[PDB]
Design a protein around this ligand. Structure first.
Ligand code: HEM
Ligand code: HEM
Ligand code: HEM
Ligand code: HEM
Lengths: 140, 146, 146, 140
């Protein structure tokens, strides 16, 4: 689980994202499909070509869920329950691909905010992404 | 994995626009920071108590430099990752007792450190090219893992 | 990859004391209940919603005989463990996209089920050997993941 | 985290363990050291030969904490924070080893309690030991 400084770093790091989160989510997904193309198989109904309108509007969705998670760090299971139904119960996403998207999202963050992506902030966000991943891949 | 020449040109092209000692020093440091249990393998290195101490550790900088030298040596022999990483695989296997899952953590840190240094020049296509390389290095580092 | 013939005699001598068909049925069923994301790969199999339903699912039992029989063949060529499963790694990697980490999970179920059936006679030595068998089979099913 | 069903199966399963805990905790360690010999490098001072006084007495300690975890499921980070410090801060145990040890525990319960080691119980216990692992491996 997270520490006080994790929570502080996650919240601090999330503030600096601002309105870029919608785009950082879209880039994270595109990096996940480009590097790990077997994750395309979770989105057969999507146009998953880069620049696709569908991945754009979905990166905004994933973003909004991460900022929600960032402001409810004590109890992720409660605030992501409806999202845990989706990814676990009906979609049944292999936990490995959350690691994949988490890595691509941190690649995105390193690629856009170099002065802010310190080793300490990085470690906290990795743990942040590990906590949300555990919540969503749970309870089938 | 085998890489198209377009991917080799992409990997070797972007490699010539970073300085490897910075990559190595930053990747090993971030590994020890992001994944704290890897510190256990570095007790002769002294203080690894904080992210501050880790990135200031002079032995860490030294070792990241040697790690990146071997990685760089892999970049020149991508079609021979087995043979080029035979010596380091058996060292990590029989002597160091480093779990093979951690090879991919360090490989991932190399990807993320390239994105830090390169910004938007580390394209999604650039990432996929480097992802293939570190996964090959990680594989080669761990098949003589008897 | 290579067992001592003490270990080799331990696996073949305890395999003869179980019925492979229910080893496969229980193992595959226990994977589906313990690691339920594995069910995504099994949508034509019908009802997988509960533990009792998986254990009463007739096609899960039928598929465990396929899994366990191919496993049985692996027990006849522990030295060329790579070639017997090359068609299967081909099939799990490129046509089903099973992540290779899940091959370890099924092998763990085979180990837990062997202990279930055999009780005291599944000693740590018995497990140590069978762990080597499932470890090598799992790595064999992963040889074609590039 | 766990579900009410998982919490019900954990207390019930551990309840059916009884005074066998300390024995199972030692056999589990003995299974880990034999199947996964690198795990022995974490106990360089222990006897760790089959049958041992120290390994047996240590198996009890492992069994005692699990009993504590089994009755504090809604607050593992609190009741395991002392153990987290030892394994995460002090020893720095590689997470892979908590999965090896968890696996040997389930082999032990499968080997000793056929009738009670049902697939449902097995599933709840794997989430139990995995939650405990996360706490014991996390820094916080
Ligand atoms: C940090 C991790 C993740 C978060 C926060 C997240 C969040 C979301 C959100 C907000 C939605 C839309 C819910 C709605 O408004 O209806 C969604 C849907 C979905 N997610 Fe994720 N997700 C994550 C990881 C993943 C991963 C790793 C995959 C697959 C590799 C995945 C696959 C999907 C799919 C297929 C949908 C359905 C979209 C559709 O049917 O149009 N998610 N997720
Ligand atoms: C991309 C992955 C890796 C590469 C390319 C790599 C490469 C190297 C190199 C070049 C050396 C120096 C050997 C020598 O100079 O004789 C080394 C040693 C070492 N490696 Fe790594 N390594 C990798 C992953 C890891 C990981 C994941 C760990 C532990 C978590 C680790 C721990 C060590 C240690 C402890 C040493 C010896 C340093 C000492 O004893 O002071 N390595 N490795
Ligand atoms: C030691 C591990 C495994 C062995 C020995 C094994 C063996 C086999 C065999 C022999 C088949 C026969 C193909 C057929 O006739 O349909 C098969 C199919 C299949 N396997 Fe496995 N497998 C293993 C692991 C896994 C895992 C981990 C998964 C998913 C989590 C999986 C999912 C499937 C699926 C979906 C099929 C196709 C079923 C169908 O369409 O009838 N397998 N496997
Ligand atoms: C859920 C799994 C585990 C539990 C519940 C557990 C519990 C414990 C407990 C209660 C102690 C004694 C603490 C004290 O004396 O106050 C201990 C010590 C220790 N544990 Fe574990 N442990 C687990 C997993 C592991 C693993 C995977 C390893 C290493 C492979 C490990 C290595 C050690 C070591 C080296 C000690 C110190 C022994 C001594 O100095 O007496 N533990 N653990």
């Amino acid at each position: 689980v997270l520490s006080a400084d994790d929570k502080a770093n996650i919240k601090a790091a999330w503030g600096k994202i601002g309105g870029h989160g919608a785009e950082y989510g879209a880039e994270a997904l595109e990096r996940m499909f480009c590097s790990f193309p077997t994750t395309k198989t979770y989105f057969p109904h999507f146009d998953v070509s880069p620049g696709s309108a569908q991945v754009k509007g979905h990166g905004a969705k994933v973003a909004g869920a991460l900022a929600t998670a960032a402001s409810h760090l004590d109890d992720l299971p409660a605030a992501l329950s409806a999202l845990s139904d989706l990814h676990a119960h009906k979609l049944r996403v292999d936990p490995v691909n959350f690691k994949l998207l988490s890595h691509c999202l941190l690649v995105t963050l390193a690629a856009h905010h170099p002065a802010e992506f310190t080793p300490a902030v990085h470690a906290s966000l990795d743990k942040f992404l590990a906590s949300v991943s555990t919540v969503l891949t749970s309870k089938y | 994995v085998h890489l198209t020449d377009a991917e080799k040109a992409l990997v070797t092209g972007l490699w010539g626009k970073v300085k490897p000692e910075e990559i190595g020093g930053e990747a090993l440091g971030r590994l020890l920071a992001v994944y704290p249990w890897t510190q256990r393998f570095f007790d002769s290195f002294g203080d690894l108590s904080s992210a501050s101490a880790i990135m200031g550790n002079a032995k860490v900088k030294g070792h990241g430099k040697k790690v990146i030298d071997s990685f760089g040596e892999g970049l020149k022999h991508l079609d021979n990752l087995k043979g080029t990483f035979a010596s380091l695989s058996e060292l990590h296997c029989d002597k160091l007792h480093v779990d093979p899952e951690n090879f991919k953590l360090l490989g991932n840190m190399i990807v993320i450190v390239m994105a830090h240094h390169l910004g938007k020049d580390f394209t999604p296509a650039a990432q996929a090219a480097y992802q293939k390389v570190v996964a090959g290095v990680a594989t080669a580092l761990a098949h003589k893992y008897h």
